[PDB]
Amino acid sequence: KVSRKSPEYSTVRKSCKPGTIAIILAGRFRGRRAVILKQLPKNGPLVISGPMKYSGVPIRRIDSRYIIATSTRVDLTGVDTSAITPEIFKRETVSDERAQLQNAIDTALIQAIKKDPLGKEMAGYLHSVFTIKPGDAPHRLKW
Amino acid sequence: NRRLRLRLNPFQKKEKAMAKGMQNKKNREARHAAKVVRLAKARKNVAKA
Amino acid sequence: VLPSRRSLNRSSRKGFKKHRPDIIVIDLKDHVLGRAAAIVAKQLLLGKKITVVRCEKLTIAGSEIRNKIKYLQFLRKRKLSNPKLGPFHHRSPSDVFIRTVRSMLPRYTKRGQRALRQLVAYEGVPVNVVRTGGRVVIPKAQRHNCYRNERRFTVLGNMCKHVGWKYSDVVEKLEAARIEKSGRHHKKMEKVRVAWKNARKEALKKMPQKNVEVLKKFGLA
Amino acid sequence: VRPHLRHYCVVGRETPSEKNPQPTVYKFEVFAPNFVVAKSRFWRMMREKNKVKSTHGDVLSCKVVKDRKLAARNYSVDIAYYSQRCGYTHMVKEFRDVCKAGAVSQAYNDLASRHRARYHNIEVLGVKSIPNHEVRRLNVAQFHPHNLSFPLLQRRVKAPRKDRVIFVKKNSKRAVVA
Amino acid sequence: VKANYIRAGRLVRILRGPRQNRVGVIVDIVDANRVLVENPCEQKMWRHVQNLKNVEPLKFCVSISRNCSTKALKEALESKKVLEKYAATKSAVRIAAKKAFAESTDFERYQLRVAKRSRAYWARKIFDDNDKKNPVSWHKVALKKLLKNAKK
Amino acid sequence: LHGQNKNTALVRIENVNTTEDAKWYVGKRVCYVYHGYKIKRCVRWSKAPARRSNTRAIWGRITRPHGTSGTVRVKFNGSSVPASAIGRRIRVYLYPSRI
RNA sequence: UCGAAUCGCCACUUCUCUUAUCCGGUGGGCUGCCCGCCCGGCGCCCAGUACCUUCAUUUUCACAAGAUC
RNA sequence: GGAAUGAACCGCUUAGGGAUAUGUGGCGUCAAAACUUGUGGGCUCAUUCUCGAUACGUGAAAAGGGUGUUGGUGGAUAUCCACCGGCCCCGA
RNA sequence: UCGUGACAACGACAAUGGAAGUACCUUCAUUUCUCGGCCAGACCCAACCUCGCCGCGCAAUUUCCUUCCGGGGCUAACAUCCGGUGGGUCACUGUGCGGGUUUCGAGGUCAUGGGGUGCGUGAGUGGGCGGAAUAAAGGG
Ligand SMILES: [Mg+2]
Ligand SMILES: [Mg+2]
């Protein structure tokens, strides 16, 4: 029933949902893990922020074709993520309000992770990095 | 192509609906059971002749 | 291949000490000559660096007299006008293997000549390759997978000895010394191997129990 | 499933006319890869035995015969083949198989290997499931006794296609190339 | 000269094909190349034909007659309980381990890495304290020889 | 046997060895890395001066599997890959990802 | 002087032999079956499985902008 | 475009170019394709012009032989004789 | 046809030639410089082309399956085989075919065209976009 003109319309694969844990495949943060927060209003990129104290990835935009979405999911009902908006990236040494937004989001995200029964294992999991060793076959894996 | 198929044959919608009903699970199991009974009954009656 | 002074000064300026490229060492004992060469030739063309050892233990199907006659027929071909230009008949097992591989390459192009330069062949296991790592085999060219048990085969070293090879006794003496030296060292260094195995068994009793349960589930301990 | 040369039964007759009303109906057994070949063999036999050609005849039925259950049995096949040098040769052979189609498929491959006879030069006269104590071939009767057992030697094992390698380490199973 | 014999009642493991790594019992021999296999207690594994190049014979064997009914085979398996004995073998454990890794979810893969790193850390520590006394490694043996140069 | 066509290239990837395996890599981006002999323009020549070098790359994509053994066919955008690359390294990246 | 392509390493691999062969070795009981006995590794982000702490503005892919020699 | 090579053989017959699929012929290396495919049967061992292996292409061979090995047919007796094939060997 | 300065490299396939790139030159032509007629990436619509998954019709599925007794055979049996008796209402191996709009999990086009809904005379034709309705006629 959703129309293409409506903002809520989107065509992204069903594995990429809020709270999903993804592996970054390209960029300066290649091989690191992060958490998908939301999607931009139109059919735009996703916004990811792995807890910056865990993996070192700040709030950023990323295309859905450059992340591998795993099956591990953290409940995100508590985190509002309403402050995330296209204008924060539209504006062109970090700024004060950007730091405040990052701190607020990280605090809520960390509490949600610890709420999971495997909270400690999840925190260690977010620390790990992914790499292709000699003799690996990523096409045979399940994720 | 769906719109070309319907343009050339306006009966396509009902023909496909018959196929979907043929594939339905409950109806196809009843049809299989009914066929076995009908064939077996005729075999016994013909032999008794 | 011996470095010149220019290479020595450049390495000293930049502080470079040693470098070893990626090389695969193949033990050719009890391998079929034709099938080993065909597999090696393709891998060379794909850009691999290969070193083969123990070339004198290659095997060819058929009796020794049949294969000896085959080589003598090849030895008869020569340029009558000037034999020093004619075909060259190399006699050592490593030279025979290199000739066989060369016949399976585009040898008259620069691409083919480069591929041939990437192969090094030895008789026995020389001292400079003993400590370089574990050797490999080619399962599709092994004797016990290729020949029926009742057939008769020829060992390349014995065939070459009777057509002109002169170093069969030298190679045999060197191999005897290497087996003695390596066997003594492997009898040594067993206390460390046993100690390492004991340490792993001592673990799973001090390490966390949750991680032990995971190892059991995946069949590792 | 494995064997080619399925088991067919073809029923046909000659087209009725006002010299020969109500012609005789014939039944024919044949082993063919498909029913088109099966019908071709039927009309060849009808022509060479009853002077009836496919142009003046009808085919009433052509189906596949169902065999018995799966078990180890002895099959006797009497077969004939032609060659220019010797003419027609007739023989009776025995095989071990689980179905009639399998035994006949074995015979066709055996005749090609041992006598170089192709499919269209071969005629099958019959196939029967005979009991033990009625086999005259030692190479077949050796599988009869109870407590029969033998080992597997000179095996040539191959890995599943997903795990085949080219180079492997000498004292382990670790792959090097591929 | 030492092998498991092919006969009625011998347990085999399938090598390749749709039934790869399954276990069945030989119920009959047809010729030098083919046999009949059945496993009543497992899905699929009804009576079917198998080539002798596609099986491996195991140590266990059941006592049945040639071409026995699926029933009598069932009680024979239950009485001997060979299926349980095979499952406890080391080779069966390795096969199940290989399968479990193929169906992992990449979070258990992280857990397996943590467990393997924890075991390796403790092995290194235990080895080191047992090497301080009774030197074994190259550096401890060399250190003892160099300390013997104490005439200065 | 008649000759070669240089508009399509064949790439062999490690640990694939199967057509079903090669189907996983259809549509992935690849590149061939080499070097020239003087520094020329590159991406982010002004934003990231540390990237300036003699290194160069030629990009392409995987189109379809080749044969039955994991070989794949690659087209390098609008031109051919130079023949000096025969037998050299090719990078196969994991994006665009369908997982 | 040189900006370059290559991207697992180990003093647990880096000894030997066999495949009609105890597939780690090795006995007994009555052909073949049954019953026993003794004994590749690391590496993938806390130098270690605790859950402490720095990563940003390089703001959506681009030769790893980093390593090795 | 194929049969290594060939006016006439096999396929196909032609404006300048992409994608897809085939024909003849092929899938150990040269050389693209079974990284030496099958969870298909048999047969063959061939010492100095060196067993055999793409028709046309005789563009390499006969009469006559073999207790080499592997199959049949007809007779006898609780294994023996006669005859006919397949591959290989002598004739060469 | 020859000399000279500078430069380009080059084994031995006699040179010359064709096709497709690349490394160094050239500064010849054209475009752009706060918008670009440049280079990449992802997304949307149409068209064409693939893959997963789920199925159907037909006496094709009785030269068949099962129980018992009588032979026969093996070893004490069972079994292969032959006559009958009584029952026959997870794969059973042939032959024709289907399935996304009150929706049956995806992919490719650097191998196609788009203004990529902006819009005002630059013709979204759609079971697919709008706005009404709710089993409407047609099957087991
Ligand atoms: Mg090839
Ligand atoms: Mg509508």
**d(Cα D110, Cα D102) in Å, to the nearest integer?**
12
Q: What residues in C contact F87, CB-CB < 8 Å? A: 45-47, 111, 115
For residue A67, list its beta bridge partners: A24
Q: Which residues of A touch F (CB under 8 A)?
A: 13, 15, 25-26, 65-69, 135-140, 143
CB contact C27 to D (< 8 Å):
yes
Q: What residues in A contact E106, CB-CB < 8 Å? A: 70-72, 141-143
**d(Cα C73, Cα C90) in Å, to the nearest integer?**
14
Q: Do E126 and C215 touch (CB under 8 A)?
A: no
User: Which residues in 57-76 of chain F line strand G, with CB less than 7 A from it?
Assistant: 57
Peptide bond into D131 cis (omega under 30): no
Query: Quick check: C7 and C33 in contact, CB under 8 A?
Result: no
* One-letter amino acid for residue A3 of the chain: S
- C-alpha distances (whole Å) from D178 to each of B8, C100, D164, D166, F70 are 55, 24, 8, 6, 11
**d(Cα A14, Cα F98) in Å, to the nearest integer?**
11
Query: Quick check: A57 and A36 in contact, CB under 8 A?
Result: no
Pull the structure tokens for residue C209. 């129990």
**d(CA A84, nearest CA chain E) in Å:** 29
**d(Cα D39, Cα D28) in Å, to the nearest integer?**
10
The answer to whether some atom of strand G lies closer than 7 Å to the beta carbon of F77 is no
For residue D29, list its beta bridge partners: D9
- Resolution to one decimal, Å: 2.5
Among candidate residues D175, D171, A135, the one with its CA nearest the CA of residue C134: D171
Supply φ then ψ for residue D177, to 5 degrees: -110, 125
Pull the structure tokens for residue D121. 């030069």
First to last CA, chain A: 32
Cα-Cα-Cα-Cα torsion E29, E34, E40, E42, nearest 10 degrees, comes to 150
Query: Quick check: A137 and A37 in contact, CB under 8 A?
Result: no
Map residue F63 onto helix, strand or coil.
strand
CB contact D138 to E (< 8 Å):
no
**d(Cα F14, Cα C46) in Å, to the nearest integer?**
12
Q: Do D177 and C135 touch (CB under 8 A)?
A: no
Q: What residues in D contact C48, CB-CB < 8 Å? A: 177
* One-letter amino acid for residue C9 of the chain: N
The answer to whether some atom of strand G lies closer than 7 Å to the beta carbon of F12 is no
Testing the interface with C: which of D167, D173, D174 to mutate, by most C Cβ within 10 A? D167
Nucleotide nearest to A110 (CA to C1'): G51
The burial class, CB within 10 Å (0-12 / 13-18 / 19+), for F39 is exposed
CB contact C46 to F (< 8 Å):
yes
Query: Quick check: A80 and A27 in contact, CB under 8 A?
Result: no
Q: What residues in F contact A67, CB-CB < 8 Å? A: 97
Q: Taking the CA atoms of chain B, what radius of gyration do you get in angstroms? A: 18
Beta strands in D42-83 (DSSP E): 57-64, 73-83
**d(Cα B13, Cα B21) in Å, to the nearest integer?**
13
- Give me the half-sphere count of Cα atoms (radius 13 Å) on the Cβ side of residue E61: 13
Q: How much distance in Å is there from the Cα of F57 to the middle of ligand 1?
A: 27
Question: Solved how?
Answer: cryo-EM
CB contact E110 to A (< 8 Å):
yes
Beta strands in chain C (DSSP E): 24-27, 50-53, 59-61, 119-121, 136-137, 153-155
Q: Which residue is nearest to nucleotide H18 (CA to C1')?
A: F7
Q: Tell me the Ramachandran region of residue A98: left when phi exceeds 0, alpha when psi lies from -120 to 50, beta otherwise.
A: alpha
For D65, other C-beta atoms within 10 Å of its C-beta total: 11
Q: Do E3 and D97 touch (CB under 8 A)?
A: no
Residue whose pair of structure tokens reads 């009497």 in the numeric block? D78
Give the angle C38-F18-C101 at the CA atoms, nearest 5°.
10
Neighbours, chain C (3 or more CB pairs < 8 A): D, E, F
For residue C153, list its beta bridge partners: C61
| β E34-38/E23-29 pair status | antiparallel
The answer to whether some atom of strand G lies closer than 7 Å to the beta carbon of A56 is yes
Q: Do A71 and E106 touch (CB under 8 A)?
A: yes
Pull the structure tokens for residue A43. 């059919």
Q: What residues in D contact F15, CB-CB < 8 Å? A: 178
The burial class, CB within 10 Å (0-12 / 13-18 / 19+), for F88 is exposed
**d(Cα C139, Cα D178) in Å, to the nearest integer?**
13
Sheet containing A20-24, strands listed edge to edge, beginning at the edge strand earlier in sequence: A60-62, A46-48, A33-39, A20-24, A67-73
**d(Cα C54, Cα C122) in Å, to the nearest integer?**
6
